[PDB]
Design a binder for this molecule. Structure first.
Ligand SMILES: Nc1nc2c(ncn2[C@@H]2O[C@H](COP(=O)(O)OP(=O)(O)NP(=O)(O)O)[C@@H](O)[C@H]2O)c(=O)[nH]1
Ligand SMILES: C1CNCCNCCNCCN1
Ligand SMILES: [Ca+2]
Ligand SMILES: [Ca+2]
Ligand SMILES: [Ca+2]
Ligand SMILES: [Ca+2]
Ligand SMILES: [Mg+2]
Ligand SMILES: [Zn+2]
Length: 166
C-alpha cells in the first residue's frame, strides 16, 4: 500500500502534537509537553485508497533538535501549523517554509497551512490574512481545532491530496 510521509512543523505550543494525537488517537491533549521528535503511524482509508500515514511530529521549541532538518528530509508533505491566537507563530511560518524548501531542495513541496486553535476566541490572525499567505505559497489554508476535532481530518487528508497532485 501507499505510505504518505507527513511532517508537522511550526512554532512551539501551536498544537502540532495535539493535532497529530487527535488525528491518530482520537483525544485532545490538554497539557503542554514540548516534543523532541515523535513518530506516529496509522493505516487509514482516504478517498477509497487504503493509506499508511507516517507522521513526524517535530519540535517547535527552537532548542530541539539542532538538526530537526535531518528528520524532515524524508518528509513528502508538510503541515505548517500556527495558532490563530498567536501572531508570532503566524509570522514564524515563513521560516518553517524556508526550512522545508532547504531540506527538500525544492520550492515545490506538498504543504498545507494550518491555523490551529480555531475554537479559541482570542483571534489575532484573521482567516483572510492566512488565506493570502497560503495563496502566495500556492497551498491550501485550513483552520483546525485539536480540541474540538474541527478541520483535523481535513488538514491531514488535504495534505495527502496535495501530495497526490504532486
Ligand atoms: N484550545 C486549544 N488548545 C489547543 C489546541 N491545540 C493545542 N492546544 C493546547 O496548546 C498547548 C500546546 O499544544 P502542543 O500540541 O503540545 O503544541 P506543540 O506545537 O506540539 N508544542 P511543541 O512544539 O513544543 O512540541 C497544549 O496545552 C494543548 O492542549 C487547539 O486546537 N485548541
Ligand atoms: C519534492 C520536490 N519535488 C520537485 C520535483 N518533482 C518530482 C519529484 N517528486 C518527489 C519529490 N518531491
Ligand atoms: Ca485530554
Ligand atoms: Ca538542502
Ligand atoms: Ca490584525
Ligand atoms: Ca471521522
Ligand atoms: Mg509537540
Ligand atoms: Zn517532487
Amino acid at each position: 500500500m501507499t505510505e504518505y510521509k507527513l511532517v508537522v512543523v511550526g512554532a512551539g505550543g501551536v498544537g502540532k502534537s495535539a493535532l497529530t494525537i487527535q488525528l491518530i488517537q482520537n483525544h485532545f491533549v490538554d497539557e503542554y509537553d514540548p516534543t523532541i521528535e515523535d513518530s506516529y503511524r496509522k493505516q487509514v482509508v482516504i478517498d477509497g485508497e487504503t493509506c499508511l500515514l507516517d507522521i513526524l511530529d517535530t519540535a517547535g521549541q527552537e532548542e530541539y533538535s539542532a538538526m530537526r532538518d535531518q528528520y524532515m528530509r524524508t518528509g513528502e508533505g508538510f503541515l505548517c501549523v500556527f495558532a490563530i491566537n498567536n501572531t508570532k507563530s503566524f509570522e514564524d511560518i515563513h521560516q518553517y517554509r524556508e526550512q522545508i524548501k532547504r531540506v527538500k531542495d525544492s520550492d515545490d513541496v506538498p504543504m498545507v497551512l494550518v491555523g490551529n486553535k480555531c475554537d479559541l476566541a482570542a483571534r489575532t490572525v484573521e482567516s483572510r490574512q492566512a488565506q493570502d499567505l497560503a495563496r502566495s505559497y500556492g497551498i491550501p489554508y485550513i483552520e483546525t481545532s485539536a480540541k474540538t476535532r474541527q478541520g483535523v481530518e481535513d488538514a491531514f487528508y488535504t495534505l495527502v491530496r496535495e501530495i497526490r497532485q504532486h
